[PDB]
Amino acid sequence: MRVVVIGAGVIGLSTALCIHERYHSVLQPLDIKVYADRFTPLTTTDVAAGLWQPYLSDPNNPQEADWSQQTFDYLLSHVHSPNAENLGLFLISGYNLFHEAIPDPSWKDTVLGFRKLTPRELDMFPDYGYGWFHTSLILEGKNYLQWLTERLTERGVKFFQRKVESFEEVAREGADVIVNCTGVWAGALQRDPLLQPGRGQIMKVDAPWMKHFILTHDPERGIYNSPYIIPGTQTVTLGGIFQLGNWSELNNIQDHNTIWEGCCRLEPTLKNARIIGERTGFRPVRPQIRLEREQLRTGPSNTEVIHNYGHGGYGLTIHWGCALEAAKLFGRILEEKKLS
Amino acid sequence: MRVVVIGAGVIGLSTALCIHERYHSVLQPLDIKVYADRFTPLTTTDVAAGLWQPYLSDPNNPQEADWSQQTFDYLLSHVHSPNAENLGLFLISGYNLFHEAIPDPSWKDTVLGFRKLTPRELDMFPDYGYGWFHTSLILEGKNYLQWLTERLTERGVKFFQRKVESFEEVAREGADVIVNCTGVWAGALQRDPLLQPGRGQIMKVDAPWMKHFILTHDPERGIYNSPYIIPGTQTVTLGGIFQLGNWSELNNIQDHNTIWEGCCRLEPTLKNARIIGERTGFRPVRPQIRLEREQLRTGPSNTEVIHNYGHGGYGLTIHWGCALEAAKLFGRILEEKKLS
């Protein structure tokens, strides 16, 4: 049973880990390899703050809400272990601000102590007249990716640095199952018109007195096109950029100024903070995540494919539920091949 | 009108400032000097984490409830100014954990979004079954003391490093009003058996993922004698030491281990944290703060004295209201001396 995972971000690596730990005992030769063009420092996953929070409006598919729930409950049970620091995982409380009232989110019972903001709290944010407060989790991609890598290494999983031209090429070399975790680039292996870049840009700043997150919202501009501030372990993320269709992997001055001005209005104490870095990434926007099987018909006998991509702006939020779902699908492949 | 302020802790400097800012225009020669033994890096105020939170049970003097409230609103309306970093002021949320049920505190409407810990939250803490959650402020003494200083310096307040043997000495040399802000050492100038040292021993640690304060309680052990973790700007404070009558200003190994063990139990990710430093200090314990006028019968005409000491383990929490009251008492002196 040769299994090739394409992609080394949160989705690929988490899926790879789930598959190994769940099926390495019920398969004699279980060889899992990971192919990726880019690894642990240079992925979209690295650009993410790693704040756990789904989109405001309900998901196109009600499964995602469970995958999110599952992810939260899992990371929560581990928040207080010694692993936590290596993971980059910790608790954080903060604000979601709006101009008008809005219905409570679906995940309001997932997070800790969800409530609405009080007048005193609102006075701290004059540009806004409504919002929430709650306690969530942060999984910093850069450390989490490092953890996964090392978990996988000790499990015999080999990593190879290469760009895959097609599924057929990988099947031609001997893969029985191909797990597709190519994020926003998935379309280069199989035309997917529903998958598009959600380009974002962020600023890492030194502001260690920030202990709360602050997400602003505005329908007039779109999800995550509003200033936000996310305290990390070493630095603070400043963001607020979302651009459908933009494939430019390049820091932009205009976006720089938008991040910087937005967040300063929001938190005046930021004016003297020192700028550590700046990065651009592409959210794999898709009306819903593609998490399904497909039999790639090719020659004598076809090869199995599990697609796992299109997690948009909530990959770290949902990755675990997805992995478990991918592993179940892997489960079914085995029983059909009558190997369980 | 010669005013001599004794003491350079948060109480001395804030009182000094609050008096100068309010009466320099209504008095032609208002020459204010600060006399102190120890200054801005080596005082009790420097050892304090700076968390705003009064004692758990109501104070035998209900003016204190107001003095703390006045302090909270003052710092809160300054949290988003460009001066916040300079003062060491910032918002922080966190947990108060208890074994049994306890009644809500008097200051429950002062803080932001005070509420009870939900079952899910309490599970993060196995050794506790009750508690609160809210949003407070931190005012780090070291920064604050430095800010107060530069403000006084530019107001023309002169500082002098010297140990004052008696009030008589200070009147004898020309003081018309003496402000007594000598903290726990007040008794060396005027006998007062109620004022006693509450020794503490904190530990500064590098754990930048900690975003919440965690305070544990136990009546079977005493106030601030139970483990607590308070995240600061550059480092995290670990404490839980309150010893009545102990005058030893020296770090104790047994206290170390107690701090270190109780905080690890409470937050296991602490195990691998780097220890930056450790310090001892003396809370000026008194059943209530002495903030009152007195006449010293020194020579032909008596000199005025404003006493402001005995702030216990809540001096930063209450400092501003005290300084306003002292200033008010300074005004009552003026009109009586026929100078208002």
Ligand SMILES: Cc1cc2nc3c(=O)[nH]c(=O)nc-3n(C[C@H](O)[C@H](O)[C@H](O)COP(=O)(O)OP(=O)(O)OC[C@H]3O[C@@H](n4cnc5c(N)ncnc54)[C@H](O)[C@@H]3O)c2cc1C
């Ligand atoms: C600015 C920004 C902020 C974000 N903040 C958050 C947040 O706070 N919380 C949250 O949950 N999410 C956040 N996200 C979203 C999150 O970053 C993504 O949903 C997640 O990173 C996507 O993971 P992925 O593994 O699918 O893709 P990626 O992390 O991009 O990994 C894709 C992998 O596939 C490889 N690959 C692609 N094609 C090939 C090929 N042909 N051959 C070989 N390898 C290939 C790439 O090299 C890479 O290794 C943010 C995104 C951005 C841009």
Ligand SMILES: Cc1cc2nc3c(=O)[nH]c(=O)nc-3n(C[C@H](O)[C@H](O)[C@H](O)COP(=O)(O)OP(=O)(O)OC[C@H]3O[C@@H](n4cnc5c(N)ncnc54)[C@H](O)[C@@H]3O)c2cc1C
């Ligand atoms: C471990 C610890 C943690 C704490 N944490 C907090 C907290 O989180 N929040 C909070 O609100 N409070 C906290 N406190 C309490 C706080 O530190 C004290 O309440 C406060 O600092 C007292 O201020 P002060 O100005 O009276 O005295 P100090 O800061 O001790 O200053 C006294 C001044 O008087 C001078 N002086 C005294 N006698 C003479 C003399 N004869 N001649 C000349 N000068 C003299 C001294 O040199 C010094 O300059 C904590 C205390 C400790 C020990």
